[PDB]
UniProtKB/Swiss-Prot annotation, chain A:
It is found in: Cell membrane. The chain holds residues 393 to 521 of 522 of the full protein. It comes from Chloroflexus aurantiacus (strain ATCC 29366 / DSM 635 / J-10-fl). Belongs to the ATPase alpha/beta chains family. Produces ATP from ADP in the presence of a proton gradient across the membrane. The alpha chain is a regulatory subunit. The gene is atpA. F-type ATPases have 2 components, CF(1) - the catalytic core - and CF(0) - the membrane proton channel. CF(1) has five subunits: alpha(3), beta(3), gamma(1), delta(1), epsilon(1). CF(0) has four main subunits: a(1), b(1), b'(1) and c(9-12). This is ATP synthase subunit alpha. It comes from the Bacteria.
Swiss-Prot record, chain B:
It is a peripheral membrane protein. NCBIfam families: ATPsyn_F1gamma, PRK14111.1. This is ATP synthase gamma chain. It comes from Chloroflexus aurantiacus (strain ATCC 29366 / DSM 635 / J-10-fl). InterPro entries: ATP_synth_F1_ATPase_gsu, ATP_synth_F1_gsu, ATP_synth_F1_gsu_CS. The gene is atpG. Produces ATP from ADP in the presence of a proton gradient across the membrane. The gamma chain is believed to be important in regulating ATPase activity and the flow of protons through the CF(0) complex. It is found in: Cell membrane. F-type ATPases have 2 components, CF(1) - the catalytic core - and CF(0) - the membrane proton channel. CF(1) has five subunits: alpha(3), beta(3), gamma(1), delta(1), epsilon(1). CF(0) has three main subunits: a, b and c. The keyword Cell inner membrane does not apply. Keywords: ATP synthesis, Cell membrane, CF(1), Hydrogen ion transport, Ion transport, Membrane, Transport. GO terms for molecular function: ATP binding; proton-transporting ATP synthase activity, rotational mechanism. Belongs to the ATPase gamma chain family.
Curated annotation (Swiss-Prot), chain C:
One of its GO terms (molecular function) is proton-transporting ATP synthase activity, rotational mechanism. One of its GO terms (cellular component) is proton-transporting ATP synthase complex. Belongs to the ATPase epsilon chain family. F-type ATPases have 2 components, CF(1) - the catalytic core - and CF(0) - the membrane proton channel. CF(1) has five subunits: alpha(3), beta(3), gamma(1), delta(1), epsilon(1). CF(0) has three main subunits: a, b and c. CDD domains: F1-ATPase_delta. Produces ATP from ADP in the presence of a proton gradient across the membrane. It is found in: Cell membrane. It comes from Chloroflexus aurantiacus (strain ATCC 29366 / DSM 635 / J-10-fl). Pfam families: ATP-synt_DE, ATP-synt_DE_N. The keyword Cell membrane applies. This is ATP synthase epsilon chain. It is a peripheral membrane protein.
Length: 129, 285, 130, 128
């Protein structure tokens, strides 16, 4: 999952000097800068709040795919925090499913994929940002 | 030379290169649209260019060659147009066009004819104000892609003064776009004498429905406006190319400064650490 | 069957083949057809008509000129408008020209362009100790 | 008197950044930089020419109260020297008054305020 994360972060760092000029830039450059800012806001974490491996996997899968684009940058952290509660309460099974097959060679998988997609879509539909 | 002050210098100059790096490409992006606007405006100027050639061939009588096309005798007062970028950092382009205008002004005053200047952009406006020769008409705050209406505030006044006899000839100084690296100032006649270098194309005759005089009087103000519009638009493209060149030179100068400062910072740290081990070894003994 | 070209000082509006032209001539409206006799005329604030296989598009011309030749018919109209965008009521192009343009094309550029000039200027005196 | 001097000089040092590059500043900034130049040039004292407390106080009062705005920067030192000559010859009594009551809590006494601004105006009329 995190290969795309690392690539996008590297690309945004390459264009980090254009953050305050993103308005008058290329559309793809603006999209990359927006994605990098969203990712950096996502990586922000409070103290004494450890995230288990399955939860981080779900968060990174949601971030790499075009899901957080509609969510504004200042609210990315709160989006993640609420989505963790949603997974912990609304869909306790998807977290266990992710944790069970975390060692599978093919990470994406077909089942876990649809389960996590459905959970993310349900959370984004129920929530407003 | 304290191994830390140079570090601040390195950080500051590295910032300068990054800022100029942004400056270099934003002007290039505006350079692309300025050239695009020039190409889009070209058919309008080109299509009517032979219309002047066709019209000027038809009308030959000096008495009926009235209004703007009058080749006035005993020249007294000529108004000249200078177009300048609103902002700085362009490079030698601003100096060259002002020097070209200054040379032209001195040549005419030697001829005994008084001069006037109409300026586009703030840079030309302040330069003539500081010189003491106040321009009669100015047009600043022009956008990157200005419309023909913006230049009407100056062109109409120039033509009205020309018609009233206040001005007997009219000129423009614009940054000619030769290439992405060369932007030389250019001088062009605005007195609508004729434009037949196109060989008047087919030189086909027409039936002037409003009349010879009416068509002539309604096309000459439009022709000079198009010429001014093209020259201002050409200057905008030349401005961005000059700014692009200046930033690329500045970035290379900044990068050269970083390497020069890096070596001094590197030498200072070795000099400092050489001392740092020196007294402690001396203190040990 | 005559090549029509509506060229404006900002851009080219249309350059297709036209059947008939209902030009608003100064003295009186004239028709222009595939092989019309040579003509070049002033226009007045009016409403020019173009016929496309029985369909009329009101390319209202604020004003300008029109050179007609037996081969082509260029529209030197200095200013021309269109009854499109709900008769200009929708003004979709003007709508963008109001927001998508004249708001971010230069105003966003100008504030950003001036802003860069600032942090450029202030840092040079902050490094004016080398 | 010198609180305004120090504040204006520090502000002028702050605005030197705009002075070096930007020339499109409004009239208030132009006059601000001009006043800063007035003050900093006024600080250009020569060698072996000490000035007593009354002289410096009077000069700084004249400068801070906009009585020196019209004087161009290159001539300010000569203006100050001539003002000292005027005080040493025309009005030594204002110098005596200023020195006598320099310890008062409120120095700009109306008695002190008069015969000094009047002396400044008399000198301004006398020279240029």
């Amino acid at each position: 999952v995190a290969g795309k994360l690392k690539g996008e972060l590297a690309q945004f760092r390459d264009l980090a000097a254009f953050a305050q000029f993103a308005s008058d830039l290329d559309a793809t450059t603006k999209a990359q800068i927006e994605r990098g800012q969203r990712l950096q806001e996502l990586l922000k974490q409070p103290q004494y709040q450890p995230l288990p491996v399955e939860d981080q996997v779900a968060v990174l899968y949601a971030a790499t795919n075009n899901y957080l684009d509609d969510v504004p940058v200042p609210l990315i952290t709160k989006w993640r925090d609420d989505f963790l509660a949603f997974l912990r309460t609304a869909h306790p099974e998807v977290r266990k499913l992710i944790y069970d097959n975390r060692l599978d060679r093919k990470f994406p998988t077909p089942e876990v994929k649809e389960a996590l997609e459905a959970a993310i879509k349900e959370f984004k539909a129920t929530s407003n940002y | 030379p304290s191994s830390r002050e140079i570090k601040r210098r390195i950080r500051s100059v590295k910032n300068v290169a990054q800022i100029t790096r942004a400056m270099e490409m934003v002007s290039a992006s505006k350079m692309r649209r300025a050239q695009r606007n020039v190409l889009a405006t070209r058919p309008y100027a080109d299509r009517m260019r032979e219309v002047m050639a066709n019209l000027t061939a038809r009308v030959v009588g000096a008495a009926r060659r009235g209004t703007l096309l009058e080749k006035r005798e005993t020249v007294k007062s000529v108004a000249l147009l200078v177009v300048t970028p609103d902002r700085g950092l362009c490079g030698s382009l601003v100096a060259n066009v002002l020097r070209r205008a200054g040379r032209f002004i001195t040549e005419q005053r030697a001829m005994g004819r008084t001069v006037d200047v109409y300026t586009f952009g703030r840079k030309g406006r302040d330069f003539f104000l500081r010189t003491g020769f106040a321009p009669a008409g100015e047009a600043t705050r022009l956008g990157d892609a200005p419309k023909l209406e913006a230049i009407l505030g100056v062109a109409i006044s120039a033509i009205n003064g020309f018609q009233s006899g206040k001005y007997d000839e009219l000129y423009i100084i614009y940054s000619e776009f030769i290439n992405t690296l060369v932007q030389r100032p250019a001088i062009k006649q605005l007195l609508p004498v004729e434009s037949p270098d196109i060989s008047t194309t087919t030189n086909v005759d027409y039936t002037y429905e409003p009349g010879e005089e009416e068509v002539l009087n309604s096309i000459l103000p439009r022709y000079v406006e198009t010429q001014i519009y093209q020259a201002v638009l050409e200057s905008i493209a030349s401005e961005h190319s000059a700014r692009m060149v200046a930033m690329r030179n500045a970035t290379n100068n900044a990068k050269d400064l970083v390497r020069d400062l890096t070596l001094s910072f590197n030498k200072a740290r070795q000099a400092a650490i050489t001392k740092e081990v020196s007294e402690i070894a001396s203190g040990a003994a | 069957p005559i090549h029509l070209e509506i060229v404006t000082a900002e851009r080219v509006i249309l350059s297709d083949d036209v059947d008939m032209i209902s030009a608003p001539t100064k003295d009186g409206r004239v028709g222009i057809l595939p092989r019309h006799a040579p003509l070049m005329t002033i226009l007045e604030p009016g409403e020019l008509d173009i016929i496309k296989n029985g369909e009329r598009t009101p390319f209202a011309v604020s004003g300008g000129f029109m050179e007609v030749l037996p081969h082509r018919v260029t529209i030197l109209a200095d200013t021309v408008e269109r009854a499109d965008e709900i008769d200009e009521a929708r003004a979709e192009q003007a709508r963008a020209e109001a927001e998508a343009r004249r708001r971010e094309a230069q105003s966003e550029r100008d504030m950003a362009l001036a802003e860069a000039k600032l942090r450029k200027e202030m840092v040079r005196l902050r490094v004016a100790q080398l």
